[PDB]
Every structure is written in structure tokens, then in C-alpha cells.
Ligand binder design. Structure first.
Ligand SMILES: Nc1nc2c(ncn2[C@@H]2O[C@H](COP(=O)(O)OP(=O)(O)O)[C@@H](O)[C@H]2O)c(=O)[nH]1
Length: 290
């Protein structure tokens, strides 16, 4: 009997990476495989063969009973074939071309596998597609509770929490960016809706946006708006993303613009009230006690 594996490969934003990871974990758990977290080629890391996982999270060798490999051993180990999806059995020269259509086919093939009664006979499952929505919300919560941010990032979160969140009810606003005038108008309406709700503590607005113009505009339109200020630059970008993602999950209400963004998925799982645009033009509120 030989060790078998599920490899979770993802190189996009962390919301996507961590949700896709939960899907891979859940299959590994179901089928008695080792999970490999392979974030080589991450958008936040300049070096293309460095596993990005340990640049942001502490080493983990086990997640809820599933053995994990999450470090530079991905560059030393030969993960055994045959592989699934079957594209991964092709010669390397044939794997140079990996268009979106192949990636989307593999999403579908993995989805089918995950739903099937029988485990695959492949010794290694390679997950290198978006696996958002491909697991239970419980699997997603389990991931957030069983990996830990590096201490330098936690310390920043802890400082910001003490400075801004503590003693207050925070409305978190995620704005992922004639068109722009409307959209700013809609975000303003969402904030006004959120502010008209009752909170137990005095209200502040936490803005997370990837745009400078949005911060200046929203801050000029509402009181008590704050934000977290902004190779080495890739890692700082990643840290700043994680700080924002985690702090959003500590808000009393979160506004998701748009609610399709994985960035606010963690917040969506944890926060008591979520506001989003639905009937377009119209705002909906979700209660999540849970
Ligand atoms: N620091 C920071 N980065 C953001 C914010 N919104 C988006 N980003 C960056 O863009 C990436 C978005 O990808 P993901 O988290 O998968 O969310 P999605 O692409 O909007 O589904 C985030 O992980 C961040 O790296 C934000 O409010 N604050």
C-alpha cells in the first residue's frame, strides 16, 4: 500500500486559494489521501518555484486528521501517477499549453469526481482549477480554524483591532474595483442602509478597497471611515490582503461589493449581517447568527 495524494494548486487571490484548499482537503479527508498545498507561482511571490504558503501561514503537518505537505518539499518529492484529471498524465512538453478551457474542463471533472461514490484509482489528484463552491461551508470554516497566519501578520491584525474595532460596532465595506459614478452611488446607499440598523456599540466604517480614489470619496462622504494603510512589495501586498480579509470577518455588518468576490467569503461565514446587491438595483440583507 502506497501513499496517495491530493494536490491543491492555486495562485490567485487568497479568498479563492483558501476556498479551493477546503475543497481539496475535503476530498483528501474522504479518501484517505495526503494533502499537498502547492502555491508555487502565486501572484504575491516574485520567485516562481517558491511555495507561497509558508510566506503567509505557519507550517502545518496535519489539518483535522489529514496529513499535509505545505512547504518547499513540493520541489523535492515526485508525486506518484497515474494522475487525475487525466491531462496530467500527458508528457510535460504537451502540458506547456494549459488554456482556460482546459482549466474549466478540469473544474468540471473534479466536480464530478467529488460527487461520485467511488474514489479515483489515480494515485495523485491534481487540483489546479477554481474549486469555489466545491465543498461544504463546514470544510471552509475548518480551514480557517486550522491554519494560522504568520505572527508578523497576526500582530498587525491585533494592533488594528485594538485601535479601531474594540469597543465599537464595525460596518465593513469591501469594494473591489458613468459606470464608476453609479457604483460609488450604490456603495453609498449600501453604507446608509447598514448605518440605519441598530448596533450595540458606537458605529465605525471599515473600508477595504483596492482603489485610492474610493477610499478618499467614501471617507469624504461618511464619518468615522478608516482603512488599513495600503519581491518585498509582493509579500507586503499579500499581507495587506490577509489583514483586510481577517478584519472584515470581525465586523458586525459586512457590505460585499460584489458578493461574488471570494475575498469576503470568510466574512460571509462569520459575520452576523451581510448586505449585498441582489433584482439589480436592489439591496438584500442576510442574517447569519448562523
Ligand atoms: N488589501 C486588499 N486587497 C484586496 C481587496 N480586494 C481585493 N484585493 C486583492 O485582490 C485579490 C482578490 O482575489 P480573491 O480574494 O480571490 O477575491 P475575488 O477575485 O474578488 O473573487 C485579493 O485576495 C487581494 O489580493 C481589498 O479590499 N484589500
Amino acid at each position: 500500500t502506497k501513499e496517495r495524494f491530493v494536490i491543491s494548486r492555486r495562485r490567485t487571490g487568497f479568498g479563492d486559494c483558501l476556498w479551493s484548499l477546503a475543497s481539496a482537503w475535503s476530498y483528501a479527508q474522504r479518501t484517505g489521501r495526503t494533502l499537498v498545498i502547492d502555491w508555487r507561482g502565486s501572484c504575491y511571490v516574485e520567485q516562481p518555484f517558491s511555495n507561497a504558503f509558508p510566506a503567509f501561514f505557519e507550517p502545518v503537518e496535519d489539518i483535522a486528521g489529514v496529513p499535509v505537505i505545505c512547504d518547499d518539499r513540493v520541489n523535492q518529492l515526485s508525486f506518484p501517477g497515474p494522475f487525475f484529471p487525466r491531462w496530467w498524465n500527458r508528457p510535460s512538453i504537451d502540458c506547456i499549453n494549459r488554456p482556460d478551457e482546459q482549466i474549466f474542463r478540469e473544474r468540471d471533472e473534479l466536480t464530478e469526481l467529488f460527487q461520485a461514490r467511488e474514489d479515483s484509482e489515480a494515485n495523485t489528484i491534481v487540483c489546479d482549477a477554481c474549486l469555489m463552491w466545491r465543498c461544504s461551508e463546514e470544510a471552509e470554516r475548518l480551514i480557517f480554524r486550522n491554519i494560522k497566519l504568520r505572527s508578523e501578520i497576526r500582530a498587525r491584525i491585533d494592533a488594528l483591532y485594538e485601535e479601531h474595532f474594540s469597543g465599537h460596532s464595525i460596518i465593513g465595506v469591501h469594494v473591489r474595483h458613468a459606470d464608476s459614478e453609479l457604483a460609488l452611488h450604490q456603495v453609498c446607499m449600501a453604507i446608509r442602509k447598514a448605518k440605519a440598523l441598530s448596533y450595540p456599540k458606537p458605529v465605525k466604517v471599515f473600508l477595504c478597497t483596492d482603489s485610492a480614489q474610493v477610499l478618499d470619496q467614501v471617507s469624504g462622504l461618511f464619518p468615522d471611515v478608516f482603512a488599513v494603510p495600503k519581491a518585498e512589495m509582493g509579500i507586503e501586498g499579500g499581507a495587506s490582503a490577509l489583514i483586510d480579509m481577517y478584519l472584515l470577518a470581525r465586523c458586525a455588518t459586512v457590505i460585499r461589493f460584489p458578493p461574488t468576490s471570494a475575498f469576503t467569503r470568510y466574512a460571509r461565514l462569520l459575520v452576523p449581517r451581510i448586505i449585498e446587491f441582489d433584482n439589480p438595483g436592489h439591496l438584500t440583507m442576510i442574517d447569519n447568527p448562523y
